[PDB]
Amino acid sequence: MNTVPFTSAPIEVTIGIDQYSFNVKENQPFHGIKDIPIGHVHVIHFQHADNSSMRYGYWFDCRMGNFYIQYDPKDGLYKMMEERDGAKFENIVHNFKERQMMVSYPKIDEDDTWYNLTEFVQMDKIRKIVRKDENQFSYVDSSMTTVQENELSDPAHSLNYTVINFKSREAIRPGHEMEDFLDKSYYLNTVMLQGIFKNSSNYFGELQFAFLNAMFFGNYGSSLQWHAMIELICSSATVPKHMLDKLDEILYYQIKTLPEQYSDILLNERVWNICLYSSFQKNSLHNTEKIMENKYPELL
């Protein structure tokens, strides 16, 4: 079990750790988060009390180094940092643990939610979507735009998601215009899965990595990316059977976890009604359709 110590909490802030969150009051004696499960990628995120504008946060993997949080009063946010002196880090963490100034990552033992939401999310790929190579962790906020959004403006601070565009030469073979536009199997299976991702796990990882940035930061371009990657599968007549089974499982847990009150801005009515009710794979997402219809029958 790993730990993300905080130097201090000088400003009132809601802190998120994966799908959990807790309130810290201005100058409350808070010194971080303990018992974080090794083996998964995590995100630790922030919403200031005084300015709910800008949810921001950091993707990290405790196996990749010792990380801490330190408020920076010039730039005005809680920054993730790496401590390279490992003896200094253990000593600091042990003091805070002894004085019981850390909140415990509150995992219920029955609960596989986090694993089911990050199963294919890979930290090494995250560094490439969110390019900042001097750090082993990756910062994301509400306002960051995607590479494709910047095509339709600071490239260093963008989300380099995989470019998917259904009306594009990459997506449409000369001479199969209608075939390829109505049945996207060529674009999914040859162009994307065989040419760009290499395998379905890499593809599931971005879909999971898209969704989590939408849910945790209200990142619009990430929501667009999640929906695109769903639609490309649902609109392909030929999908490996194991990908459809896994997809159903992935979406089921994403819909389960979504805040009940946020469905109106995170979920695209056209994509979901198309995918569940009109597309080639309309009969292939049984779990996802059962949970959508029982929880968001309004959208449909």
Binding site: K167, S168, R169, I172, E177, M178, F181
Partner: protein
């Protein structure tokens, strides 16, 4: 974006543009089978592509053999439409290619957008106008060349005949649309109007009769009357 009454005069500026109408591409007769079922028999049709400034009509003719062994023909027909417009542009010299193509039905936008990905600088646009181009198969000479075709081919016409010698394209287009609206609302009366006086003939190289300026005014007014009329007969006013 879309084309409507407020930007109506863009059609006659000097940017090359084309209207595409696909309402006559897939045409069928519906009939009873010996077993008392219903079946369609397709007949030849055409893609109606028109330069509104010059009057040039690229009648790209659809023989029935193109539907053979195909499914979902109404959907295929929008893609067939998109495919034969795209190869026409490809063939055409660059300085003759359109800067805009305006489709008369929104269902064509995606088929045409996909077929023209290679021409990102050609704007594909819808329109709010209710243009009467479906009535083009009420022009006898066009109907004739479509029904006689034994293979897919493209015949070129000027739908304005020689009118641009005496009127502007705005006025020529308005005549054409009034003629077509009339033919669409009541083909018989519209046609009775056009051919009553046997002294006025259609030149072999024309679609419409050879009216003087004064005779066109009479004709145009009669066609308005007809369109007003049939509107009353249709709503009881």
């Amino acid at each position: 974006g879309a084309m409507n009454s407020s930007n109506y005069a863009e059609l006659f500026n000097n940017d090359i543009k084309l209207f595409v109408d696909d309402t006559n591409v897939y045409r069928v007769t519906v009939h009873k089978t010996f077993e008392g079922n219903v079946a369609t028999k397709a007949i030849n049709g055409c893609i109606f592509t028109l330069n509104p400034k010059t009057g040039h009509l690229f009648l790209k003719i659809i023989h029935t053999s193109v539907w053979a062994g195909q499914k979902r023909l109404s959907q295929l027909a929008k893609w067939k439409t998109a495919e034969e417009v795209s190869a026409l542009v490809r063939s055409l010299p660059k300085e003759e290619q359109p800067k805009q193509i305006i489709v008369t039905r929104k269902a064509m936008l995606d088929p045409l957008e996909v077929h023209m990905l290679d021409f990102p600088n050609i704007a594909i646009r819808p329109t709010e106008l209710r243009l009467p181009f479906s009535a083009a198969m009420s022009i006898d000479k066009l109907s004739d060349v479509v029904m006689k075709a034994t293979e897919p081919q493209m015949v070129l016409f000027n739908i304005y005949d020689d009118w641009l010698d005496r009127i502007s394209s705005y006025t020529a287009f308005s005549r054409l649309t009034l003629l077509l609206r009339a033919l669409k609302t009541n083909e018989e009366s519209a046609k009775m109007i056009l051919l009553s006086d046997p002294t006025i003939t259609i030149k072999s190289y024309h679609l419409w009769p050879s009216f003087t300026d004064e005779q066109w005014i009479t004709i145009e007014s009669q066609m308005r009357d007809l369109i007003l009329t049939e509107y009353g007969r249709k709503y009881n006013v």
